[PDB]
Scaffold this active site. Structure first.
Site, PDB file in Angstrom:
ATOM      1  N   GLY A   1      -1.099   3.494  13.431  1.00 44.78           N
ATOM      2  CA  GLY A   1      -0.444   2.822  12.324  1.00 44.78           C
ATOM      3  C   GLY A   1      -1.245   2.947  11.039  1.00 44.78           C
TER       4      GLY A   1
ATOM      5  N   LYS B   1       0.791  -1.237   0.000  1.00 46.56           N
ATOM      6  CA  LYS B   1       0.000   0.000   0.000  1.00 46.56           C
ATOM      7  C   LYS B   1       0.828   1.295   0.000  1.00 46.56           C
ATOM      8  CE  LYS B   1      -4.116  -1.631   2.520  1.00 46.56           C
ATOM      9  NZ  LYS B   1      -5.280  -1.021   3.147  1.00 46.56           N
TER      10      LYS B   1
ATOM     11  N   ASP C   1     -10.753   2.872   1.765  1.00 46.66           N
ATOM     12  CA  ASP C   1     -10.931   2.559   3.187  1.00 46.66           C
ATOM     13  C   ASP C   1     -11.548   3.723   3.958  1.00 46.66           C
ATOM     14  OD1 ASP C   1     -10.194  -0.129   3.622  1.00 46.66           O
ATOM     15  OD2 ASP C   1      -8.058   0.372   3.545  1.00 46.66           O
TER      16      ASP C   1
END
Lengths: 263, 263
Positions: A125, A64, A100
């Site tokens: 994170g 990612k 997301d």
């Protein structure tokens, strides 16, 4: 035929292939969505392969971050978050997005949970960063916590948030577990039951197990709860929309996901 | 899901709505494509509406060139050509592409007109730029002419082509009318009959009338001819794939367009 896939390592247990399979069939489209194991080392060659044979793909760990550079265009949201989970291929060009953040937001709404902060994100994170960004843009006050206090303070600075101690959880109305605490650990939770707010709602992004201790405690404490599946279903439905312009029923996406999970 | 439109001033009789209605239907997709009159001054506002409700739009006169400044990203080809005829909306962002150039080449191919130059493109305007770009890409020797000599000379320097006087048409093997001469005027043609070569092929972008004076002259000289419908169909089909990832039948779209002309 529409050709899709999820690239990451591992991906043998991704629920995306099942969801998108339902998307394809439900929407009466011919195509496939395959899980393609791709270590960070194969990312370069894999993308070039995407440029020529796939309409789109999702990216999961560990690709990612290192994907942004190889793309021709990255969304502002994906640039800030610093992660891309959805790649679109048009005319041999690769465009990166992050479904997301918006998926998360749409999941809460659909789930029935009114956005109503202040909101607290546990974990600074990858997952935390994505969720933190989303709630801010939605118009809610946002605080962040992390095991290691450092990572928290910085993010509050980068995104313009507040790094609070775990104790502050009592003063929030929206709790979000972005850590791995609870993952395949029914007896583990990142938040002590005593530090739970009196009212509000809680969302856990960990869906294995589906009903983690965090959500069970939160439910017992009277808070509204939401598992991690709705978000998974929405990011997937949004990704599909990005690729073809058609939105598969997020409910059907979630059900396909649950069936895949076997729970 | 899937709402498109052709933005132009005027667009009252665009054949796009017809072609695309057929695209969606032939693909078993629900959606719409309507002509939306849009003057040059009204285009900043139009694109904002586009971002909120349209999956994609095609742009015609006189928006193709002014559009670039109001987009998030523009393809290398569209940038070089200087015009966008196809816009894609994803997550509210707008991406510009040019399907006229690739569409022109597919049209020639499908129509049984192989690439043989020198190719003389009449009209150094927008349509001419797109066709010239495509033929240069295909590796043919490209000549360009324009009523105003300066424009043809500038274009030739820009693309590395050769500006020529109309008489050179006698040595060209592929002729393309990219001017507006002949548009709804059976008595007008950009090229005097005596200057047509006696071998080769001729393509006219003007399709109203379908059999322009230009094409009738070329056909009379024994040249293989193609109307403007094939290019219209292919640029639309390619745009559709851009928007959805699916390629509607170009012949089917040309046919839909034909029936929509009343011919």
């Amino acid at each position: 035929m529409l050709r899709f896939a999820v690239l990451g390592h591992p991906v043998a247990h991704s629920l995306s292939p099942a969801m998108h399979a339902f998307a394809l069939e439900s929407l009466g489209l011919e195509g496939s969505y395959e899980a393609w194991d791709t270590p960070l080392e194969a990312l370069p060659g894999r993308l070039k392969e995407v440029r020529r044979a796939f309409r789109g793909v999702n990216l999961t760990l560990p690709l990612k971050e290192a994907a942004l550079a190889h793309l021709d265009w990255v969304s502002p949201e994906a640039q800030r978050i610093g992660a891309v989970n959805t790649v679109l291929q048009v005319e041999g060009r690769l465009f990166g997005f992050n479904t997301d953040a918006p998926g998360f937001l749409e999941a809460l709404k659909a789930g029935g949970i009114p956005l109503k902060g202040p909101a607290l994100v546990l974990g600074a994170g990858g997952a935390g960063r994505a969720v933190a960004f989303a709630l801010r843009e939605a118009g809610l006050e946002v605080w962040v916590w992390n095991r290691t206090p450092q990572r928290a303070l910085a993010l509050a600075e980068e995104f313009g948030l507040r790094a609070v101690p775990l104790e502050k959880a009592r003063e929030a109305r929206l709790l979000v577990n972005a850590t791995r605490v609870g993952l395949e650990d029914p007896s583990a939770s990142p938040l002590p039951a005593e530090l739970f707010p009196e009212e509000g709602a809680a969302v856990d992004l960990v869906y294995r197990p589906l009903w983690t201790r965090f959500l069970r405690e939160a439910k017992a404490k009277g808070l509204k709860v939401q598992t991690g599946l709705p978000m998974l279903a929405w990011q997937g439905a949004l990704a599909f929309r990005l690729w073809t312009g058609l939105l598969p029923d997020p409910s059907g996406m979630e059900e396909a996901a649950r069936r895949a999970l076997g729970v």
